[PDB]
Amino acid sequence: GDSIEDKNARVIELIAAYRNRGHLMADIDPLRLDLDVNSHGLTLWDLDREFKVDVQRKKLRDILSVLRDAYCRHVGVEYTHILEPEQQRWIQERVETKHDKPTVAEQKYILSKLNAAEAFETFLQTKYVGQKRFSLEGAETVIPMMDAVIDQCAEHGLDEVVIAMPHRGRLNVLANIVGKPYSQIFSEFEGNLNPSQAHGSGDVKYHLGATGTYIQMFGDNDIEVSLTANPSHLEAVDPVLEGLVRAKQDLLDTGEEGSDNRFSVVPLMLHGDAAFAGQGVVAETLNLALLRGYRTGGTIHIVVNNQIGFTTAPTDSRSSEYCTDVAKMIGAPIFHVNGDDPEACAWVARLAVDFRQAFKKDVVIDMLCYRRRGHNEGDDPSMTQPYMYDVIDTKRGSRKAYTEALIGRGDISMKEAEDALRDYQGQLERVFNEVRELEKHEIEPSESVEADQQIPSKLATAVDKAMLQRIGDAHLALPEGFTVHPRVRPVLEKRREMAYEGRIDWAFAELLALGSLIAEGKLVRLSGQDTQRGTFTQRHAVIVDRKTGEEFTPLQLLATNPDGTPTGGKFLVYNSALSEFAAVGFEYGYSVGNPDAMVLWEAQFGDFVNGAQSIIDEFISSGEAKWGQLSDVVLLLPHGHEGQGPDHTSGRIERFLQLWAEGSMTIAMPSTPANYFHLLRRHGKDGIQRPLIVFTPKSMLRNKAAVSDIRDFTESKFRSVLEEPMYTDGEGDRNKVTRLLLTSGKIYYELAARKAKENREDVAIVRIEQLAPLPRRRLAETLDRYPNVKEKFWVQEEPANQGAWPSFGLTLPEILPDHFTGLKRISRRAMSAPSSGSSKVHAVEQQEILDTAFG
Amino acid sequence: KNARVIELIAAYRNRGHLMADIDPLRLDLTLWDLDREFKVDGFAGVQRKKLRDILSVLRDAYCRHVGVEYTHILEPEQQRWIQERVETKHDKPTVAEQKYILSKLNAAEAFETFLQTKYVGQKRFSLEGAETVIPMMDAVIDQCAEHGLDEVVIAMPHRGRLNVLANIVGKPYSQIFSEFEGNLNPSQAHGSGDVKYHLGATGTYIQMFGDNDIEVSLTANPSHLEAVDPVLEGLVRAKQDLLDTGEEGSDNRFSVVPLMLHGDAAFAGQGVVAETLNLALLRGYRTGGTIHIVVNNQIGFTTAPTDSRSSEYCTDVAKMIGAPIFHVNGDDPEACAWVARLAVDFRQAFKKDVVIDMLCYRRRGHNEGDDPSMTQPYMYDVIDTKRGSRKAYTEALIGRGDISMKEAEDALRDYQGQLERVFNEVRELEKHEIEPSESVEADQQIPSKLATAVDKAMLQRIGDAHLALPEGFTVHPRVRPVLEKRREMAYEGRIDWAFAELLALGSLIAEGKLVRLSGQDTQRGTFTQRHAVIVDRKTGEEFTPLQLLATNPDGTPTGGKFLVYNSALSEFAAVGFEYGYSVGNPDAMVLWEAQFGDFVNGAQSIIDEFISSGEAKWGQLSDVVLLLPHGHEGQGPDHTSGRIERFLQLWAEGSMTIAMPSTPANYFHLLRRHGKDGIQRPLIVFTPKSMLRNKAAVSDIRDFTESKFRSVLEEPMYTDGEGDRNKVTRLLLTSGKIYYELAARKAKENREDVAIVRIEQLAPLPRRRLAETLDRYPNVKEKFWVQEEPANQGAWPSFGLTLPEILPDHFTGLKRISRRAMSAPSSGSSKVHAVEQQEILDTAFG
Ligand SMILES: CCOP(=O)(O)[C@@](O)(CCC(=O)O)[C@H]1SC(CCOP(=O)(O)OP(=O)(O)O)=C(C)N1Cc1cnc(C)nc1N
Ligand SMILES: CCOP(=O)(O)[C@@](O)(CCC(=O)O)[C@H]1SC(CCOP(=O)(O)OP(=O)(O)O)=C(C)N1Cc1cnc(C)nc1N
Ligand SMILES: [Mg+2]
Ligand SMILES: [Mg+2]
Ligand SMILES: [Mg+2]
Ligand SMILES: [Mg+2]
């Protein structure tokens, strides 16, 4: 036969090989540190021969040039892992073509960005040699690349770009991308802060955020740009950014829950190479990308891949070929780009935005670069990486190289290039001198943020009977032909009954609070593991048609007034992924993104929230004091000693009480359905943006004593301290009391039952419903009503090193010495675990506490 | 026609798995060219095959009960190896092998239906709908024994846990029934304990048809799904290092196999999965490949897969380390066993991870008291029509003529009758009184007067090792002074913190101990202080001075070794791995170092669920050391605190030792005590940063040769100098670096009326030594606990409450001197830190 047929078969193989594996041979590294193949008779003599390609006839030389330019020069394209053929086709059409050369104006603009990037760093090196700044030097191309992302988003008519990033070039991005004034950055280096800058305990300069407006230079549009605050914990901000963006999209009615699919707020997430591969929160956050409850229509990721992590080489930081391989699991295309090629970096940035817009999904840019100086500006890197730094020492920076290219192209002269650099440096010198001339302020110890947010003078949380009845009736206002599961129907009927007749249980009180907020126009977002039904089969926020699988959400009916007009409210209820770190981070972020939303995250059991410890420690408990960033997120933590073992017993009350300071969080363990209802309504309506930690029940959901009357919802309020009903409403005599038992949570009912059984008029039980801030005034006033008390005990089911005793045992006698001197503890022994593993052992220990309290 | 065939072969290999008949629920060119011959790359050379035959091979390999994902793998030899085994005829099992697979399905289902009958009201997380897990695991272990491997170590969650314990590991049925009965012997009832579906076991597996045996173990775990994953890897790595197999071994057998089970919702959602996979090829952590099994029942409690993950498969995360993925229909026992054996063979051939995604279903509710039709009515209507895998396989064998119905029933009734007999025997045992759980504190006790001092010759040897450079080695010019200073300190004293650490580890190595040290940038040290490894300035070659201590002066080995690594940028998986390693080799000295103590909260699940509580819950002992750089230096709220207060709150029952040493010699003695005491309990050390280079924080040679660990330290002026204790009216109790600032202030103002006492060991509290020290100051009228940490942090929250209760004649009236209570661990400003620090010093001497 004709050997052109064999040769053509090799050409088809070559095209497939460049598309699939060309990235492995691409010239992406600016440092350049690193017989049995059947050719089917194809050789260098066939370069001028025409071959069949799938439709079109082209020379081998031309096929090879297109493939080499697309896949083996300064851009390594990874996309053949993507399931959708239309997405592979979209990328092929855009990468397998001769690109239009940028205009001289565009080239000068890119150079102005590289000038600003390097000169900002060398200026800080000259003025503040002894201070850490985590310089971008060796990765200056990040600045024209981020400019190109934002400019392309503005071109698509998008509303906002929200950035999260680590330390690398942070100050540079704040000044040269977001627009944080140079004067402000210099004042941070000077340590000369005004009262607004010195507010709260604060944080380091490379953790701060900013907001501004990006104005296009080549078009008629502009776009909002924000950069969120973060702790040192690398990648921890990733789910926070997604939550922040989702809240903004929901507000704009764009995205998943919106009337249009614009997803008009873009998450722009930066990463370091060692952190992106090593931190599990990265995989957890990527796992949220296509979920109905969390999708943001695609995140644009940029890895500042300087092929080092402090002193650690990539071979000790990851097991994958690329630091970006984790992102392929959600079908993200990956673009590896040579950081010494500013034009390729800007081109990839615009392509990434276009892909995100076309398919509303994640895209990753792996910018290969290097770190000119040590990890921080005081560290010597040649001690551990002598070869890398011998190579770095021979390298001209990307600014110098790009300037030489423009001088060579005839675009600019050396004199013009020199003058432009001196002008920008002169501007920095002027601002530096102006800041240095400012009046120095006296340095004082940091101050508590407690008084910055206070409850409004007037706020009622009580609702009328009509509201309770409406929420009860909503549970039986089923869509026509809907088939309720036969074991769910009694719950719906019981809710209508409770709404009109009382004996309201915990699960219905929660829905009365959320339903009444929705009716008042509030957005309520509730999520967690199996949260739609409830772990304890108690919530049924969503019910499923037994015959069709169709879903009905009773509380959504409260978003429409009886006359048919919308209230402005909405109920967004989701089953989360099996994640704690990313889920809690997302809900924290969501509440920051929309301060007017009611946002609740529910742990399956409180015992699993330690999986989100970095978010609790670094954002929830401390973001207000450190950054002035406010969150109103609610954490619901099922808690209680029931004999189910050490991972089904405790939300670690003691840890949240230890973290507590400056009124940063509200911490509560309500004992009645009505008090929980009032707590949630207070939290949603007070205008205070501070997290709420609630220790919620499990068996107490179905305790027939733990029910509330209609008047507790219509004629009461949140009560931080509760007395026994026999003293406030009944015929109980407070003067007969000689022993006072102070407690919190479900053990109250067991203590009250024992009191009734033995007719102990000499013992009274007082509940502390709000654990923090301690209700000092209400507690003192309650105790003053018992003048004949001779002994006081703090009773708890938790071990002695757990529960409220570690905090209360120390704070109550100090804060109220005339009431709690001599306060003694009644609890389980101190334990390494939160409880015994045996239900029988739990029961014997529980009885010991009750016997000791009445002994 | 020819071009259509090569692209058709590539389509089946790359995407055939998307059309494979893998789900047991089933919830979701020209036609005249069939007899034409085409050239293909055969497994024994180029072949000419009919398109009809090419298509039948591709459909059987990639579109029946096995979905093969492998074309993401970079190595062409690995893709070829998989093709050779999947694109050829599979070995048909013998009748005896088929009967053996059926015996495993019988045990799997009958164990569950027996527990359903006897204990209807107790959770057991039944394997029903996934019984093929049992012959699958049997096949993995049997194939490992066929390769002559030493041990299989299993970690798994709740799904079929009791079933695996009884039918794979060999945990006695009498023991499992006693747990359901709640009638435990004193050993079973020891400590606070844990739920039955978290327990472990060990035994010996004997091949049914071959001539080998293999050890099989299953480790304990908390409820926290996937948290045990890095613990399993650490446990296996420690066992491999002991056997001289694997990464640091004389052979590349990696003869201890990690077998890691997962649930589908947990595998996709928990970040510790990606962190643990990321360790798989690292020199410090590699175990030569893990075999993963996902019991993929297409549900997570009430949650559908579309709400649990964003990837096509729950296993997609594993593709990042080039693991092949085998998706297999759980209703096909023979395909499940075949994939299991193929996975072992792949792991042995390439010493890398392999994933088996077993598609199955959950017959009952999430737990046996939950009603799943409320949220998944369609799935459970389909499940209600399904014949189980045991019934279906029995019908196949009866139809094949292998067995009769009578033989099938007799075999099932025999197993059930044996369960009934053991159940009756356990139920006949008298029930005794249930008591409150007891503290494990007295279970482990330090020997009387343990000597940790070393002689001058040992110190000198470790100093001299720093300049015993390999021939032609070029030391970096800024590293050479450190090596020279170490030789000087070894012979002349003024030993600093970093050298005291290396004197402790070096002397343990010389005594024959394995020392494993790792953490972020730990080879050099975050504060450029350690230099455990030095790099040749001209060639990049590495030299490890302490490795020289593994050889005696006469040339014989000591038996010791120094394994020092830079970790991945992980806290959760790294801490879990080091905990696991210490469990795997109790004789090893194992230390993990946080970059700053402020980042160890990233490993909170390991601290809470394994380190602080594993002894009380499971009787599992770990001697892992956590080194947490800590101290108020003005570097911000994430470069200041290891959260001492949290470790002291977690502390109970003597489960951990917690210390904040103030001198290099006291740290040396602490490490040597920990390595030589024969006690297996974690040690938490709050270590210094600026104090590494504080010229006052240096130790004398006699502190190493003639002393021991001191849990309480007095000022040198009273123990050795001419200081008068009777002049003291104010006592300052403290811990850590603030001692030096308090001592400097006392010397500057000549304050003979003030004494400073350090508590070096924070937990267990040194009650006797503290009381005896305070008794030496009879004229003290006021006592203060001084700390740089905020009032709600540091040792005050625990000491403020415990010291007046345990020593009332010494600490009644104890007052606090500290920073105010704070939401963050410190101010963000170095200038603000400095003003606050001066306030503490002024208050202490006010
Ligand atoms: C002295 C070492 O610690 P550190 O420098 O103080 C710091 O904490 C800095 C970040 C910060 O504090 O904001 C950082 S910088 C760094 C190396 C990062 O490498 P890569 O991701 O490749 O980024 P890069 O190459 O651009 O740097 C680690 C491990 N540090 C400590 C650290 C540990 N673990 C976690 C979760 N977060 C951290 N910040
Ligand atoms: C009542 C719900 O909580 P729970 O059942 O008590 C439990 O804690 C059980 C495990 C245990 O406690 O050991 C488990 S079972 C489960 C669903 C798992 O689904 P999948 O991975 O697909 O496995 P499966 O389908 O085989 O079940 C969750 C979320 N539970 C709570 C939980 C949450 N978060 C973490 C990190 N670990 C957990 N154990
Ligand atoms: Mg890096
Ligand atoms: Mg609020
Ligand atoms: Mg599952
Ligand atoms: Mg020990």
Curated annotation (Swiss-Prot), chain B:
Gene behind the chain: kgd
UniProt family annotation: Belongs to the 2-oxoacid dehydrogenase family. Kgd subfamily.
Domain statement: Is a fusion protein with two major domains exhibiting structural features of an E1 and E2 protein, and a short sequence stretch of E1 localized at the N-terminus, which is connected by a linker region to the rest of the protein.
Binding-site list for Mg(2+): D264, N297, I299
Domain of life: Bacteria
The keyword Mitochondrion is annotated on this UniProt entry: no
Residues annotated for acetyl-CoA binding in this entry: T657, R673, K708, S711, Q761, R768, R769
Designated name of the protein: Multifunctional 2-oxoglutarate metabolism enzyme
Keyword field: Acyltransferase, Allosteric enzyme, Coiled coil, Decarboxylase, Lyase, Magnesium, Metal-binding, Multifunctional enzyme, Oxidoreductase, Thiamine pyrophosphate, Transferase, Tricarboxylic acid cycle
Enzyme Commission code(s) on record: 2.2.1.5, 4.1.1.71, 1.2.4.2, 2.3.1.61
Lineage: Bacteria, Bacillati, Actinomycetota, Actinomycetes, Mycobacteriales
Region span, 2-oxoglutarate dehydrogenase E1, C-terminal part: 1-846
Coiled-coil boundaries: 402-433
Catalytic reaction equation(s): glyoxylate + 2-oxoglutarate + H(+) = 2-hydroxy-3-oxoadipate + CO2; 2-oxoglutarate + H(+) = succinate semialdehyde + CO2; N(6)-[(R)-lipoyl]-L-lysyl-[protein] + 2-oxoglutarate + H(+) = N(6)-[(R)-S(8)-succinyldihydrolipoyl]-L-lysyl-[protein] + CO2; N(6)-[(R)-dihydrolipoyl]-L-lysyl-[protein] + succinyl-CoA = N(6)-[(R)-S(8)-succinyldihydrolipoyl]-L-lysyl-[protein] + CoA
Residues reported in the UniProt entry to bind 2-oxoglutarate: H198, S223, H639
Role noted for this protein: Shows three enzymatic activities that share a first common step, the attack of thiamine-PP on 2-oxoglutarate (alpha-ketoglutarate, KG), leading to the formation of an enamine-thiamine-PP intermediate upon decarboxylation. Thus, displays KGD activity, catalyzing the decarboxylation from five-carbon 2-oxoglutarate to four-carbon succinate semialdehyde (SSA).
Binding site for thiamine diphosphate: R159, S223, L225, D264, A265, A266, N297
Molecular function, one GO term: 2-hydroxy-3-oxoadipate synthase activity
Example GO BP: tricarboxylic acid cycle
Residues of the full protein shown: 366 to 1227 of 1227
Gene Ontology CC, one term: cytosol
Subunit structure: Homodimer. Interacts with the FHA domain of unphosphorylated GarA. The 2-oxoglutarate dehydrogenase (ODH) complex contains multiple copies of three enzymatic components: 2-oxoglutarate dehydrogenase (E1), dihydrolipoamide succinyltransferase (E2) and lipoamide dehydrogenase (E3).
Effect of E653A: Loss of activation by acetyl-CoA
